[PDB]
Design a protein around this ligand. Structure first.
Ligand SMILES: [Mg+2]
Ligand SMILES: [Mg+2]
Ligand SMILES: [Mg+2]
Ligand SMILES: [Mg+2]
Ligand SMILES: [Mg+2]
Ligand SMILES: [Mg+2]
Ligand SMILES: [Mg+2]
Ligand SMILES: [Mg+2]
Ligand SMILES: [Mg+2]
Ligand SMILES: [Mg+2]
Ligand SMILES: [Mg+2]
Ligand SMILES: [Mg+2]
Ligand SMILES: [Mg+2]
Ligand SMILES: [Mg+2]
Ligand SMILES: [Mg+2]
Ligand SMILES: [Mg+2]
Ligand SMILES: [Mg+2]
Ligand SMILES: [Mg+2]
Ligand SMILES: [Mg+2]
Ligand SMILES: [Mg+2]
Ligand SMILES: [Mg+2]
Ligand SMILES: [Mg+2]
Ligand SMILES: [Mg+2]
Ligand SMILES: [Mg+2]
Ligand SMILES: [Mg+2]
Ligand SMILES: [Mg+2]
Ligand SMILES: [Mg+2]
Ligand SMILES: [Mg+2]
Ligand SMILES: [Mg+2]
Ligand SMILES: [Mg+2]
Ligand SMILES: [Mg+2]
Ligand SMILES: [Mg+2]
Ligand SMILES: [Mg+2]
Ligand SMILES: [Mg+2]
Ligand SMILES: [Mg+2]
Ligand SMILES: [Mg+2]
Ligand SMILES: [Mg+2]
Ligand SMILES: [Mg+2]
Ligand SMILES: [Mg+2]
Ligand SMILES: [Mg+2]
Ligand SMILES: [Mg+2]
Ligand SMILES: [Mg+2]
Ligand SMILES: [Mg+2]
Ligand SMILES: [Mg+2]
Ligand SMILES: [Mg+2]
Ligand SMILES: [Mg+2]
Ligand SMILES: [Mg+2]
Ligand SMILES: [Mg+2]
Ligand SMILES: [Mg+2]
Ligand SMILES: [Mg+2]
Ligand SMILES: [Mg+2]
Ligand SMILES: [Mg+2]
Ligand SMILES: [Mg+2]
Ligand SMILES: [Mg+2]
Ligand SMILES: [Mg+2]
Ligand SMILES: [Mg+2]
Ligand SMILES: [Zn+2]
Lengths: 86, 52, 50, 122
RNA sequence: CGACUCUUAGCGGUGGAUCACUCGGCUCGUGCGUCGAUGAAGAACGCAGCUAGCUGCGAGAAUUAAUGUGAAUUGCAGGUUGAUCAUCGACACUUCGAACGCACUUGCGGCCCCGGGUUCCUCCCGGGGCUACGCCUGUCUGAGCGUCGCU
RNA sequence: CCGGGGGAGAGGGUGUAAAUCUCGCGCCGGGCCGUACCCAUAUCCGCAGCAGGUCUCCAAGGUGAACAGCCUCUGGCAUGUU
RNA sequence: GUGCAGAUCUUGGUGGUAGUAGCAAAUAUUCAAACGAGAACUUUGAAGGCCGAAGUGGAGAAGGGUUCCAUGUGAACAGCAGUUGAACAUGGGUCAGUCGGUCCUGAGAGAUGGGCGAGCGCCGUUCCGAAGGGACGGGCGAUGGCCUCCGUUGCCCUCAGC
RNA sequence: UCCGUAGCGGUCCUGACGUGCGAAUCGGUCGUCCGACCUGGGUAUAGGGGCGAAAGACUAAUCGAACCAUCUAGUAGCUGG
RNA sequence: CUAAAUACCGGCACGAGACCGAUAGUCAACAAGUACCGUAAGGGAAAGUUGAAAAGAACUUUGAAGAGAGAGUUCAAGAGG
RNA sequence: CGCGACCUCAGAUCAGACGUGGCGACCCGCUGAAUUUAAGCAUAUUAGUCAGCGGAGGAAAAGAAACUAACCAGGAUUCCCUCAGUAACGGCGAGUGAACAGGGAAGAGCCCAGCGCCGAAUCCCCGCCCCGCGGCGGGGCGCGGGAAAUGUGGCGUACGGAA
């Protein structure tokens, strides 16, 4: 009874897609995320899982501002000047 | 919105609209059925825009 | 279900669009290794999470 | 014709918007041809018209931004996009002026006891 | 003689060992040592003539401008006053996210200014700018059978 | 959402009457999201087209106490991985 | 990081068993024709049957996410086969003021004030709170139009429970 | 309250099956079927904790202390190489 | 209040090696934190090599086709995606 | 009753600023075990270590003696060698365990409050004029506004200082 017969009643879901981390760990009934902890301002991370930290680090995603910061660093963050025209 | 679709057809194709009915496809795109006025003819509008 | 929400339907729309085979002309390219689409999904086999 | 960015800069904003609204009519006419099924010459012109629209809008936005920074050139308070965007910590530093103050005590100390240039015989 | 079985060799299959390669790792050392409310990290969704993934990019969407370079890109088509690459200092940068009008259904607003509507008469529609918390200095409006002074 | 009790008030000086109307018509508008199909001895969960599990609506004729069992009509199916 | 036969060693590959166990729950199929290279299994007609209104019928909720529909294919899958399929490949398909969501509160969840806490934070939901940004009538002020008469916002008097 | 259907449950055959339809099913036979009844959805209680008409039962096929990661390559006078 | 000498398995850019050579070396030489699994926290692979150059086998013939037989390319198909 | 100060406390989509979150190898402040060893085990050991929390920088922290010493004395901090597996702690069992002196790398010193003297001699903000203007500054005006006597600035700080 506790196995195959009991697996047929799984029809309503506990977790949904989180709006901050994108993972399906937003507990609908506790209103919190088990992956990032969305209503908390700080994201949840721990030193007892080094493998979970390297799945979400600054090198994981697009870096759509930091990679321009790294390029702009080499010229002293020059701004408001143009190269000399032809 | 349906209002924006209505006033967008009225400017690009210079035809007034009876009503607009929208749906969202499983493709993800929004399809709009735009009914013209009874005095404008939809296929003679379609000819000048290209679809035939 | 038929009582979808907008974000779920949009996610299903993207996962519908990624489920097409590769175009025929990509493996005539010079630096090509792809034989087929290995990220394919069938509705009966893989249940997409959710 | 090839729409260049060098000869759009001397034009006025209204005759630039006229070209922009003409090229958008060109995109709509080309996208109708794409869905009806058209020539490859019509299909390959979509990338040409899109980058021309990007060029015209880039010229319009650059001209507007240059006039905004000409208007706010001598003003104490300017909009944050026209303010210099360095890094956040570098924008929260002290000025040249602020790092170049020293007190009246250190001013008279530097005056009274300057660092002398000297040498010692071997 | 024949079938079946055993051994060895030739050839052929099954299998991918060995060897030779290596735009990858590991380790050591050097220089620099730079994120974010001017909206970070992360995520979501889109963008190619034919495009699923990876990569790149953001409705200007496998990129715009400028500079250097100098005749290509290419799987197939199409079209030197500068094609393509590289640099990148100008411009731009959808949605969620510290995430900021209230909530997170993608829902309900409020104030002000514009354009249709109207002809300031409120409706209606579209667009733009504001509307989070804490805290510093100053301003304005206040409270007190707090301490007083004077009519 | 409505009815009542109260009566602060408003309206006109005998009329091209006024304030007012929950009466009959007339004018304009209603934005955003979901909507296909399966819903079960094959579209869900049990590693699967798994004799298991999974919430409901409709409910003909005869026999019969009967939504029992058996036969039949509308509808459905091909004997349940040969 | 130097020699393997073993560690119910690790990973990968292959045998005997073995063309064996098996393809046996829910009564049942038969004849003719068509398409085709090919038919026990596809389609059509004629039978004989079953589910027998608490159905093997007709519609929904949850869940699934294109499985729905049309055409083509028979490489792989559908434990025989297939001319067939929920398989593959091309194309299509979900239209609302009235049907639901959206609004309300339920059990309950959860900020601020406050309290606690080394700290992320936690407790607590009216409890140690100056918690109302509103309205009618009047006075004052300005605006815009038949500046007639309403409307607009600025200040004050007045009133207000939750 | 009794017989008894749907529903809920699971006595016996210690039947079938037992590299099964199935990591607990099937057949006949059975208990109950107006009330301490059955059931969907929402919500509350979380691990030395919950919850228990009490079997150390249940707490995602895991229960006399669930599951995941880390301390951790824990130690072994013992077994095998 | 205060530089220097001191620390640096993260980041950017580099150089080197008595290191490893696709069951090794990072989990990852490849569309790798990807496919896939679990409600979740998390777990987590496998997978390099035609040739110098696609010159990647035109055409004939059997078969419905997969498949063959000739012919042809190449130094070599005893290198046939 | 009213008016005007000051104090204390509110409300603003008031004018101008700042903080939040990320990464976290190295650094700072807390909190903090049990495996293990003691051939058992409880003090100890593991270990102020793993885990947990907060906060930064290109380094951080520390730092110019309420010091070391007992000498014919040295003289901020940080790091290396040595002191030293030493003094010492420890069911004095298992085990743990520095500092001074000495040799080097580097070397840099300083400022307030108080006590006093100077007419608050000091500081911030808004308006205008010209310049700089892409790290918002300079002088000139304003019978402009505030902060500050419940104390700003100059001299001056233990090496003495002031007149
Ligand atoms: Mg629940
Ligand atoms: Mg944190
Ligand atoms: Mg399934
Ligand atoms: Mg001084
Ligand atoms: Mg042989
Ligand atoms: Mg795309
Ligand atoms: Mg260019
Ligand atoms: Mg150029
Ligand atoms: Mg809701
Ligand atoms: Mg009355
Ligand atoms: Mg329907
Ligand atoms: Mg079946
Ligand atoms: Mg049968
Ligand atoms: Mg049959
Ligand atoms: Mg070696
Ligand atoms: Mg061996
Ligand atoms: Mg047999
Ligand atoms: Mg039906
Ligand atoms: Mg049915
Ligand atoms: Mg078969
Ligand atoms: Mg079908
Ligand atoms: Mg209608
Ligand atoms: Mg709470
Ligand atoms: Mg009874
Ligand atoms: Mg009874
Ligand atoms: Mg038995
Ligand atoms: Mg048996
Ligand atoms: Mg069976
Ligand atoms: Mg408790
Ligand atoms: Mg009970
Ligand atoms: Mg017992
Ligand atoms: Mg022993
Ligand atoms: Mg200090
Ligand atoms: Mg060297
Ligand atoms: Mg490997
Ligand atoms: Mg090899
Ligand atoms: Mg090989
Ligand atoms: Mg050879
Ligand atoms: Mg060869
Ligand atoms: Mg303000
Ligand atoms: Mg402590
Ligand atoms: Mg012991
Ligand atoms: Mg022992
Ligand atoms: Mg022990
Ligand atoms: Mg730690
Ligand atoms: Mg921080
Ligand atoms: Mg930094
Ligand atoms: Mg420091
Ligand atoms: Mg010392
Ligand atoms: Mg010694
Ligand atoms: Mg002893
Ligand atoms: Mg110790
Ligand atoms: Mg010393
Ligand atoms: Mg020296
Ligand atoms: Mg003083
Ligand atoms: Mg001193
Ligand atoms: Zn999350």
């Amino acid at each position: 009874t506790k196995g195959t017969s009991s697996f047929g009643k799984r029809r309503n879901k506990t977790h949904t897609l989180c709006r901050r981390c994108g993972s399906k760990a937003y507990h609908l009934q506790k209103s919190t995320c088990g992956k990032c902890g969305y209503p908390a301002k700080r994201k949840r991370k721990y030193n007892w899982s080094a493998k979970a930290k390297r799945r979400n680090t600054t090198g994981t995603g697009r870096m759509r501002h930091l990679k321009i910061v790294y390029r702009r660093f080499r010229h002293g963050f020059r701004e408001g000047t143009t190269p000399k025209p032809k | 919105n349906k209002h924006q679709i209505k006033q967008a057809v009225k400017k690009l194709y210079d035809i007034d609209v009876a009503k607009v009915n929208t749906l969202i496809r499983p493709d993800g795109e929004k399809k709009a059925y735009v009914r013209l006025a009874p005095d404008y003819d939809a296929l003679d509008v379609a000819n000048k825009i290209g679809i035939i | 279900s038929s009582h979808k929400t907008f974000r779920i339907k949009r996610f299903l729309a993207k996962k519908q669009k990624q489920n097409r085979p590769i175009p025929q002309w990509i493996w005539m390219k010079t630096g090509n290794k792809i034989r087929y689409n290995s990220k394919r999904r069938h509705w009966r086999r893989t249940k997409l999470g959710l | 014709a090839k729409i260049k960015a060098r000869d759009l800069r001397g034009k006025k904003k209204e005759e630039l918007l006229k070209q922009l609204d003409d090229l958008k009519v060109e995109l709509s006419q080309l996208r109708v041809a794409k869905v009806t099924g058209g020539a490859a010459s019509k299909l390959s012109k979509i990338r040409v018209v899109r980058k021309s629209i990007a060029r015209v809008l880039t010229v319009i936005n650059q001209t507007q931004k240059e006039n905004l920074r000409k208007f706010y050139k001598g003003k104490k308070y300017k909009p944050l996009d026209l303010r210099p965007k360095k890094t956040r910590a570098m924008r929260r530093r002290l000025n040249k002026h602020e790092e170049s103050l020293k007190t009246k005590k250190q001013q008279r100390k530097e005056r009274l006891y300057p660092l002398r240039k000297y040498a010692v015989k071997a």
